[PDB]
């Protein structure tokens, strides 16, 4: 019968729990209290980028630390110049229900997708002066929740039908399918060496995937509700998550445990976005009570607050050299902090 | 001025992009945006056909006014993760089939889905147009099967006109937002253009009564 499943599942859950608890010598709070505090951090608004007419859901910096891209619920996708606040391109969309965008690493393409179950590719460098479509990638049965490029020919997606996927842009067919979640998948983030990626879903669990073998390798538990955002540490050997539990957490890939939690009693709303700084000392978490906080990642104290919007902050991103910090929100304004 | 001859031509470009991005924004302050719901019966097939893979959009005109209608029934995922995209539609259109009171498993299921959207935190000020389908097939089954199969507490007659008037009281007693929003029931007279003119009246009622709150007059 199916009762012979039960002793196999229950012993292996008890075996993994005994293996993790054996190697917990001391916590991160114990060894780090000799280090000096960060002090107080005060940042100010240097630019303000205007021109959208609806709520903003996505944003991604380019790799030269000067260009960026953004998408709203109007049928527009706009590429900005962050030093002079000028507009370079403006792209009309086919469907208006947009939830994702990503910038190419060579600064050559841009991608977009939403409730119409399709990820679309745009070409910025034609011979006529227009941005055109190059591919449309179909095959998911749920809304696209994220997308990231590996190079000019491979893209990893994520949809709400419990399934991640790896594509080929030149041919059109997906070559690897990643299965194993039991709820809708919300986010992903690649690695610095570009061989692994993590993923967080509605199961209150996050998994580590292998890109070339096409299989899961580890799984991390500990949240109490859906996971909305995830981000990868610059070493390549930790990550941080963001949930509707109103709690960020820090996990480890080589000890397979949780290290520290970043909670405070005056916060009751959930996290939308998560990013790190350049040295990996600060943790920036955008919230739902209209502002954004700053956390010391090594000692769990908060250092600053960034308050500039009437409505929910829905996206943020730290640049590749470390100068600026961008935020976007539902009152239709982008602000660059420095 | 302290700008080069290239950098002086990279602001004339950015000012011709805003002049087209504005001219497509009062072009969409003319159009009316409607959401459609209901369980996946055949009631949706009649309404789309009479008004002329994830989202399906339908557009139609009636007396120089433009409507767009959004069917979101083909998704089959978690509803609490995309339903805040439709905050700001004018009116929600709901669909209920009358004759399914005995197939009492179905009729309680439509009451569960009407109650969830009528009291969301995203739809505190949105009118609910309410259609009721299959009025011809309803009087055939009521002569053979009483209403007490579906509603046990029915102390009424079980005649035709006194039973169908008991259905409208049940959907409209679920509203816990009596001081903000309103429901406009209309029996689906499937023969004429009366279907789209009720609905033409239902949106002129809600545009006028929204402007009398923006000027602070109420």
């Amino acid at each position, epitope marked *: 019968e199916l009762d012979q499943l039960r002793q196999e599942a229950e012993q292996l859950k008890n075996q993994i729990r005994d293996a993790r608890k054996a190697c917990a010598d001391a916590t991160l709070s114990q060894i780090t209290n000799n280090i000096d505090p960060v002090g107080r951090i005060q940042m100010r608004t240097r630019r303000t980028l205007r021109g959208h007419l609806a709520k903003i859901y996505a944003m991604h910096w380019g790799t030269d630390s000067r260009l960026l891209v953004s998408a709203s619920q109007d049928g527009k996708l706009i590429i900005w110049d962050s030093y002079t606040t000028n507009k370079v391109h403006a792209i009309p969309l086919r469907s208006s229900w947009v939830m994702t965008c990503a910038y190419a690493p060579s600064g050559n393409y841009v991608a977009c997708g939403g409730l119409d179950n399709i990820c679309s590719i745009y070409n910025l460098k034609t011979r006529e002066g227009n941005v055109r479509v190059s591919r449309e990638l179909a095959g998911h049965t749920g809304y696209l929740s994220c997308c990231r490029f590996l190079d000019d020919n491979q893209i990893v997606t994520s949809s709400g039908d419990t399934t991640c996927a790896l594509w080929d842009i030149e041919t059109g067919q997906q070559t690897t399918t990643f299965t194993g979640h039991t709820g809708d998948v919300m986010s992903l983030s690649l690695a610095p060496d570009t061989r692994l990626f993590v993923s967080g879903a509605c199961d209150a669990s996050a998994k580590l995937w292998d890109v070339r073998e096409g299989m899961c390798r580890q799984t991390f538990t500990g949240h109490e509700s859906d996971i909305n955002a995830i981000c990868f540490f610059p070493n390549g050997n930790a990550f941080a998550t963001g949930s509707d539990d109103a709690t960020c957490r820090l996990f480890d890939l080589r000890a397979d445990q949780e290290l520290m939690t970043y909670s405070h009693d005056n916060i009751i709303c959930g996290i939308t976005s998560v990013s790190f700084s350049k040295s990996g000392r600060l943790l920036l978490a955008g919230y739902d009570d209209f502002n954004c906080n700053v956390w010391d990642a090594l000692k769990a104290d908060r250092a600053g607050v960034l308050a500039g919007h009437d409505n929910r902050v829905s996206c943020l991103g730290v640049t590749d050299d470390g100068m600026a910090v961008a935020t976007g929100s539902w009152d239709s304004f982008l602000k660059i902090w420095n | 001025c302290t700008l080069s*001859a290239e950098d002086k031509a990279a602001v004339e470009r950015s000012k011709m992009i805003d002049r087209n991005l504005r001219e497509d924004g009062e072009k969409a302050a003319r159009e009316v945006k409607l959401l459609l719901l209901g369980a996946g019966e055949s009631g949706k097939s009649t309404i789309v056909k009479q008004m002329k893979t994830g989202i399906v959009e339908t557009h139609f005109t009636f007396k120089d006014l433009h409507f767009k209608m959004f069917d979101v029934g083909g998704q089959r995922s978690e509803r609490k993760k995309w339903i805040h995209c439709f905050e700001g539609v004018t009116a929600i259109i709901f669909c209920v089939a009358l004759s399914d009171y005995d197939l009492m498993n179905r009729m309680h299921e439509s009451m569960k889905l009407f109650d969830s959207i009528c009291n969301n935190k995203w739809f505190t000020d949105t009118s609910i147009i309410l259609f009721l389908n299959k009025k011809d097939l309803f009087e055939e089954k009521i002569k053979k099967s009483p209403l007490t199969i579906c509603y046990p507490e029915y102390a009424g007659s079980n005649t035709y006109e006194e039973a169908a008037a008991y259905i409208q009281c049940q959907f409209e007693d679920l509203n816990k937002r009596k001081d903000t929003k309103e429901i406009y029931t209309h029996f689906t007279c499937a023969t004429d253009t009366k279907n789209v003119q009720f609905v033409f009246d239902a949106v002129t009622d809600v545009i006028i009564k929204n402007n009398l709150k923006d000027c602070g007059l109420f």
Partner: single-chain antibody
Amino acid sequence: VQLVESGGGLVQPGGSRKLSCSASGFAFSSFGMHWVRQAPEKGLEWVAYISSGSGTIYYADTVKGRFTISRDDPKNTLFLQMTSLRSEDTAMYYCVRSIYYYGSSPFDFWGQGTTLTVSSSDIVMTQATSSVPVTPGESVSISCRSSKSLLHSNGNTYLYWFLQRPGQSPQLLIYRMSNLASGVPDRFSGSGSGTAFTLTISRLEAEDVGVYYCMQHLEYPLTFGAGTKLEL
């Protein structure tokens, strides 16, 4: 991508003509346009400009009151109207494409030209070479000079390099001093600083025989150098 243009002929002095070009596909309504000129057996020379959206219009101080320019935008056609022609107007005429935003490459497509023979404060560029003989396989260096610094406070240096094979239109090679255009072999390069600039060629092939020009685009009245000729 094509620009095809016609007109010209024999004109008695004091008369009038108009010139016209046509575009093909091309997304004509996002490109600013120029008219560039050269005399028989002389160098290049710049004439006029009409922007995108028909806003900014500029001219030369030689042609300020005689020539006027206009754009017929839904029909994909560019115009230039001539009044009271003199003997200094015997030349060729070229329609030239450009785009101005961050990262672009202006001056990248010339037309085929049109003959016209009538009846019978500025930054100064200079280059001294004339008809140097070069054995193939060897490296060459060509240099021009400026009377004012072209480096700007924003970091850009505005010097552009061209090439003209005999019987052809000019072609872009180096659009800003450290950047080479698309479709150009990697053996070309360019460096310089301040007011002294030089081009370099790695391995000369048989198709690099022709004249060379250097142009400034810092302050507006555009000035070309004279002609440096390569011969074998």
